[PDB]
Amino acid sequence: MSAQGDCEFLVQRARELVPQDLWAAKAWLITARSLYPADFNIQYEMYTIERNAERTATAGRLLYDMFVNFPDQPVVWREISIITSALRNDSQDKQTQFLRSLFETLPGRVQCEMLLKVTEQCFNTLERSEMLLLLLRRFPETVVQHGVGLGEALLEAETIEEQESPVNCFRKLFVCDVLPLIINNHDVRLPANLLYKYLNKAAEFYINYVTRSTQQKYIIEGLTEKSSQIVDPWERLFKILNVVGMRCEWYGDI
Amino acid sequence: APLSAQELSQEIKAFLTGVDPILGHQLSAREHARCGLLLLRSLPPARAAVLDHLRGVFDESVRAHLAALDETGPGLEDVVQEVQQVLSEFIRANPKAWAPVISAWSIDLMGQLSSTYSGQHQRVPHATGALNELLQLWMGCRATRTLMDIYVQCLSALIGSCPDACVDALLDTSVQHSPHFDWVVAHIGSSFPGTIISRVLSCGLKDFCVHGKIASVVGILGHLASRHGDSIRRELLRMFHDSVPFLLQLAVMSPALLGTVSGEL
Amino acid sequence: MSDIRHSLLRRDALSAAKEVLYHLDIYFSSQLQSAPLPIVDKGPVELLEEFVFQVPKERSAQPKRLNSLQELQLLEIMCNYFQEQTKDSVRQIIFSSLFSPQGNKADDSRMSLLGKLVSMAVAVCRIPVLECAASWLQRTPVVYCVRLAKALVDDYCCLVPGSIQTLKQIFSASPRFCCQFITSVTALYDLSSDDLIPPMDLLEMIVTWIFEDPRLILITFLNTPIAANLPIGFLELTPLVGLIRWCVKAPLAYKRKGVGMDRDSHLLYSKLHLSVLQVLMTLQLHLTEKNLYGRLGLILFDHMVPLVEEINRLADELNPLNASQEIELSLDRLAQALQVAMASGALLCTRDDLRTLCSRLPHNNLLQLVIS
């Protein structure tokens, strides 16, 4: 009726017999009034965390309410982000595909919204760069808090690194992703000299990566495949320089 | 088995009308029988013509077998065992809805064949002391054996559920289809001596009491079947004396039944 | 009509039924638009009895042709005509006499013929007959309709092995019939016999209903307000509490007074009860913001009290040691259904209606906690 403590006790008892008596689980997690929201922490989450079809809808609709009421569950977003980097291999194997699907079973928009909290508090350079890349990929025009300095910070980090071998995950990933986004994003107003310097630094880093010894196409012995990958260094640098020149007020080929 | 809900109208039209419209010809009895079995699987209310078509199939098969034997396309016996398998599958899958109706249809068609091919066929041994010849000859026609196997299944199902009315129906048919079908009752009594000989004694006593030769045939059949199983007759006589001479008349007409009378004496 | 029945009965070889259907359509052409509900017209009742039951307007009259094969052919032709009639009047006239009383001397044979014809029509994909079958229990007797539907279901599944899948497919294609069959299933699930315990095919049909018939239940709930203890039959397809109480107490009530079938199927009965509870909770969630009305709240209409009484009757004899868990599960399931129903906002009383009804319920820790 109105005995919220009794409702919580009944929810706990149903959780105890959850593996056998599934009817009480549904009747308790969907029991309105009393300690309903208090019981919607392990009862509803059990359906949300299930590997069945429940995670497709329950996690994308019921976990959002819990996050709004209490945004303290960032483990799922971090696990999905970690698994995303390692999900680009062993596609033929069933276990890797199952793990990748379990990580990505949640909605993309909901996952990005949940991981925005970790993105704001992403003190780690690699974590912050990955969060910025994910935000840019989800929304190319998502520049409200700080969009002008997104490319600037990446270019500064790449220049300060000054490594002939591009083994740095954050710098290489930033040069690969943020630089094309910075070139495409004309909303942020910056001097042409800064863009030219950033393009020159990216070109130097790409040339150094191409000339230096790497570590078949596979991940490096020390860095992830996605982070250290550079596709067509000289050609990409030339394209970036041409784009910058266009935006700066205008074999034996050459 | 499952079927689409729309195909039933055309399938039932094909079966009941006799002429198959989707193929544009009269199918043989085998395909019609298979279609009727499928209809029984799908549509229970569609059983009305299925039993009649089964009766026709069995009658034609018995006629063909008689032509092959009493004078001694080809015999259609090969579809009979298929019908046996399908009906036994219904019986063992569900005894409740299949045991009484199948047994009644079967015993009625045995009565039909007994009336049809006795006297009209002179070589068929009548129930006039040729009872053993009746039991031997009719298994030459595979349909009869098949039906007795069906009855083993049906009677086992009734024994499982309620073995009360089968014997009553059997005796009613024996009275109606007298005296040519009663060899089946004799074989049944051979399988189950006690209850059947008791009911034979009962009906014979009714016949004698009302009269003062179906009872004579029943007594002859009982005497043929009762191999050291006449103790029921002695118990009935003792009960009748406790609180009637039809047994005496039966023994007079049946010396074999009186073979154990001296030992009982 | 005796004269029309006699005129239409001639030429039983696929012509008598066609003539009877034509005459019925001509007579009830206006009735098809005025009120094509599942009702039996007395004009065509005699024709339906004569051409299907082999019994004219007089009960002891001469049967049409020789019946049997001719009767079967007439039934097939009538089913083909009714399914292709594109009007609910003919199908309703043919089939509605099975359970809805007609006040006729030959009404028993007419009812048997109507039941056979309705079973054939459902199997012959006659959507109007199945759709009207839901409306049949809305105003006619519910016990007779439940018995007829249960007999048809048993013939389809129990008597016919493997045809239950066809019945489930038809119920999916005719959700009105599937929703109307919930009351029949509840009536046939009294746990008083072996047939009362659902089989594997029955479990599959229940799963199909939970997946699809819930939409029909929601549509019916939107069609008219949820009434508390409606006249003689509502056919709302909301007998969840009674069915759950019977299924959970099947290994207890059945064992108290067949018993082995319900006792060995404790896991299957529990799974079926859980599935039914999940379906009911989903339906309540769907019909929560919708105008499902108050007053009644939980869908009981005093059936929860009968289920509690049935559980309590067996709860004192042999239940406390052998099957106390089953009785506790039944009480908990009933209380959980009542609470989940109140969670949709229909029951506007945390403990008023609970004190009115659940106070007399048996002793159970889970049920007492849920109630309070």
Layout of helices and strands:
This is part of a larger assembly, with chains A (254 residues), B (265 residues) and C (372 residues).
Chain A: H1 4-16, H2 22-29, H3 36-39, H4 43-48, H5 54-69, H6 75-86, H7 94-104, H8 108-120, H9 125-138, H10 148-161, H11 169-184, H12 192-211, H13 225-228, H14 233-247
Chain B: H1 7-17, E1 19-20, E2 25-26, H2 29-42, H3 48-69, H4 80-93, H5 95-116, H6 131-138, H7 142-161, H8 165-176, H9 182-191, H10 193-211, H11 214-225, H12 231-242, H13 246-253, H14 261-264
Antiparallel strand pairs in B: 1-2
Helix pairs in contact in B: 1-2, 2-3, 3-5, 4-5, 4-7, 5-7, 5-8, 9-10, 9-11, 10-11
Chain C: H1 2-9, H2 16-27, H3 31-34, H4 42-52, H5 69-83, H6 88-95, H7 107-123, H8 127-139, H9 142-159, H10 164-173, H11 175-187, H12 200-223, H13 240-248, H14 250-256, H15 259-264, H16 266-286, H17 304-315, H18 319-322, H19 324-343, H20 352-357, H21 365-371
Helix pairs in contact in C: 1-2, 1-4, 2-4, 2-5, 4-7, 6-8, 8-11, 9-10, 9-11, 10-11, 10-12, 11-12, 12-16, 13-14, 13-16, 13-17, 13-19, 16-19, 17-19, 19-21
PDB class: transcription
Keywords: Integrator complex, Post-termination complex, Pol II, rnapii, transcription
Entry title: Structure of Integrator-PP2A complex
